[PDB]
Design a protein around this ligand. Sequence first.
Ligand SMILES: Cc1cc2nc3c(=O)[nH]c(=O)nc-3n(C[C@H](O)[C@H](O)[C@H](O)COP(=O)(O)OP(=O)(O)OC[C@H]3O[C@@H](n4cnc5c(N)ncnc54)[C@H](O)[C@@H]3O)c2cc1C
Ligand SMILES: CCCCCCCCCCCC(=O)OCC[C@H](C)[C@@H]1OC[C@H](C)[C@@H]1C
Length: 451
Amino acid sequence: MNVAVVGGGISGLAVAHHLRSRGTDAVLLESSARLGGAVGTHALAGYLVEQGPNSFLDREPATRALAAALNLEGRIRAADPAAKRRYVYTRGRLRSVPASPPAFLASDILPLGARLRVAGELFSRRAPEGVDESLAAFGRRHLGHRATQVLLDAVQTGIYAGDVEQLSVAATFPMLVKMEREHRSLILGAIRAQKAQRQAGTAPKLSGALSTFDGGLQVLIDALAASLGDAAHVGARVEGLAREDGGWRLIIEEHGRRAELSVAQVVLAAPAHATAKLLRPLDDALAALVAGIAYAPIAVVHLGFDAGTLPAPDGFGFLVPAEEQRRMLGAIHASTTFPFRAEGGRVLYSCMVGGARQPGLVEQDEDALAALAREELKALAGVTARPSFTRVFRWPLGIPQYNLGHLERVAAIDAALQRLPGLHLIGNAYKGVGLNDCIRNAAQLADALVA
Ligand SMILES: Cc1cc2nc3c(=O)[nH]c(=O)nc-3n(C[C@H](O)[C@H](O)[C@H](O)COP(=O)(O)OP(=O)(O)OC[C@H]3O[C@@H](n4cnc5c(N)ncnc54)[C@H](O)[C@@H]3O)c2cc1C
Ligand SMILES: CCCCCCCCCCCC(=O)OCC[C@H](C)[C@@H]1OC[C@H](C)[C@@H]1C
């Protein structure tokens, strides 16, 4: 009847919250001095700066249901005004990526033949049978070379900060592969799905807008921490678990000393590496599978500027293609996107450095990373002004990379867990990277847990 949750990030918090709110007592244990994991918002120099994640697309019911059952729905905030535009640095300058098919055809985002090739997606050849094809392979077949080389690579780097050649399209973009399976052409599927909904309320309708909370994403975690209370233990590192008449025994280190705990079922919300260490003495082959999940390191450089030292930049931000051979991945554009996250007309840039193709840059110190960010923002965006604020967050264990073979690996992980009753896994490593995905998967697990 009692459950233990290892890891105090969103995956773990949401699982623990959903279990309690359905009549199942849960205990959560977190290594750090604080809950949240990657998610964290800091109040510094008149700004609200984000540790990692900045926003979520307001299109997931599970994250709405979580916000409702936590009295947060009125604190959600439009990714406000300014540019709905986004930019890609390609061929010498920042270029607006168009939002509509007619605008795209007249755009200069790609050369004429390359634009016409995207329209030729209607004649996309069949997908390779029984092959877990790469995102880049998917791109060349559907979109043409230029579109995948500049546009698809941008979307990819914006979400996973990874290698477009290594990422599995089935694991990273499941709805695109499903679309492909059903209609071959994506344009065809869009035309047909548009016809389907056109041929016939009660609660509302989700906008899909880029959203956050009024005090940043910290609002969600502070609301989770408060909802769990004494069930959420901070500075409690689990460093062992074993069987015991069904059931499970956790070895926990809290206030410098050793402690033990017996529970009916265990839920592991820790990153792949930390979870593998725990699974090792239990099943070496399963631990190997979990340990095989690659992570791309990433560092975020925040650069704040005094009101009037530079103009407010247009749009949600810009991304830079790997082929441009640059040391930065892109920037937001946070003050523009969410005005309330900056006071007194100050302008905030949140630059992203590293990814799967440049993991070595994240090892450098904070002053070197700040220097890097300024040089690139000068060469690409034309920002010459001196920053009045500078804050750097490094994640050596960054974003999990859903590379080729990932989907069959998660299947092998699932099959191995069935031989170990009462043991469960969630987290960004497995079946979704974003906040929305973690929240959804967390709720689904908790529901299925009451069996
Ligand atoms: C730079 C960056 C930007 C991002 N931007 C976005 C974005 O804007 N939109 C979006 O949707 N997503 C974004 N994400 C992705 C998303 O934030 C993460 O994938 C997600 O928050 C991970 O949550 P998690 O709980 O699954 O893992 P984690 O947050 O890492 O939680 C795992 C926790 O377990 C703890 N732990 C480890 N070992 C033990 C132990 N043995 N005992 C107890 N506890 C342990 C760790 O301390 C950690 O806190 C971003 C990620 C990064 C890093
Ligand atoms: C789509 C919702 C996010 C899904 C899960 C991860 C998304 C968060 C990306 C992690 C950060 C990341 O590593 O990529 C950099 C993000 C860049 C800077 C921004 O992407 C949109 C803007 C144009 C700007 C260039």
